[model samples]
Target: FHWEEYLKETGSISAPSECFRQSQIPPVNDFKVGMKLEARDPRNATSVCIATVIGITGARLRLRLDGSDNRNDFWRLVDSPDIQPVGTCEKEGDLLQPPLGYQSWPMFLLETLNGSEMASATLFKKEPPKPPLNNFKVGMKLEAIDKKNPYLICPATIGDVKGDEVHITFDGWSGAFDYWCKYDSRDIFPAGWCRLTGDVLQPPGTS
Candidate 1:
């Protein structure tokens, strides 16, 4: 479910604007899942922070850092366009491309919470097949994970069907962290994927 950002960034780059002048970073914009965002390490700037928005909290932004031992919530104020949305960063972002396959990644990066350094994960994990679809009807609320931002625990509804896969929409947030999940795999079933992110997978029609 978690496609760590900068699972692609290989070098350095500047921020997109001066709004983040306190960060003394450059200006750019193209934030996306699987894309990278820079955050100042609570530890060290040279260490840098590699974060992904697993969930959104009102006007605030939530992030998950790679190599960051803490598995909690950290946010940056929204509206700071200077943050350089994920897909942004002309220098580093251009070189990146989402991996091929089961197909996901609907959410885009808004801005990096990092300070002056860049951040990223080394590998973008691929998903395996789900066991078999279980006749999931639309409107059924199942606890599931949006492979794009797995860390975000969300309530999802079965939207449409593209064969054995089910089209799902994350309860909140617009954009597309939404995706099609295999019927049987842990990602869709009891706890293959959602559990890892702290979400309890529930059966359809449950309250």
Candidate 2:
């Protein structure tokens, strides 16, 4: 979709840029496909799994859990807290586990590579500071990630506001991409977020 045209057609503006914990300048992406790292299994958070970089975008990486099916691949910012260097899990005395839904012969799950070149420590950065208070208000427009299509960031508005959370409803999408998150959640960003981060923000849906 032509996002700029869509934004104008809808006559709606993006949310304020201050209601986020992301750096105004996007972090550089240095990871390449095939690099291995330790990551928390998204579906089963308690387990730390070895994952391979399968794809790379502006400031994020698409990763697939080792010994797991490809369908469960997930994306994360290069500096996301859930991911760390290869030896990080072991350093904490925690054994890495296979990702959820691994149904093949079990022995293969026990294998791990030695001397795998991992992403560097410098590649990860400290998370941005959150606004000291939840300043989001209802009807505020912003750029946000569609949880159903995790990689796509679209124009959205606040549909409801409660104590510490806000409901996000995508523009032009009816209610197909609606969710509630903490006002300071990382998935939401102020208008022009993609420009600052160099991430590709999807246009508002035409639905």
Candidate 3:
């Protein structure tokens, strides 16, 4: 994936690394499917719950909270502070809670992890330091999450920039799929990111 050639081919500019929340060198992911760990509930950040690695994509994990149904699975970077070893909450004197709509998490936890492999503490990398300022310029190109279709990563342009925020305008798409996010938002990535991560990079919209 030659970003320079692609940029020239498209006549677009890529958002520099400093404009993203991602680590300069993306974190190494060593997690295996079915491994168990603890993760903060995305819907309720304060509550740490047991999560299983259902899938892996580059440095991110497709996690499904234990005791929760499959419909609400979420993705998190391997180095994200939101996830840690299974006993992390207890070590920090915080009790792990069940996902929404479930109860008796303690018993469920015991049974689920009894013979399962827990992700090693070392597999969790330290989060990268954030850049000091927003350096995005209007018209800069980058890959961004399609908020309307959360799982898709698509080509986008910086439609606008205001202070610490940047407006994401999907390539060839209308304003309906566009959104604003902080310059350092994790949802945005540098150009060619999906190719490097083996994630599907959605082509520019034709409609």
- lDDT of the candidates, in the order given: 0.39, 0.78, 0.86
Looking at candidate 2, what is the lDDT of residue 35? 88
Superposed Cα RMSD, model 3:
1.6
- Top candidate when judged by TM-score against the true structure: 3
Model 1 regions more than 4 Å off? 1-133, 189-207
> In terms of TM-score, how similar is model 1 to the real structure?
0.30
Cand. 3 Cα-lDDT: 0.86
Question: Which tens-of-lDDT digit does each residue in 31-105 have in candidate 3?
Answer: 999999999999998999999999987678989999888988888888788999989999999898889877455
Whichever of 2 and 3 has more TM-score, that candidate is 3
TM-score of 3: 0.93
Give the better candidate number (1 or 2) by lDDT.
2
**Superposed model 2: Cα runs more than 4 Å off:** 1-13, 103-112
Candidate 3 lDDT score at position 43: 96
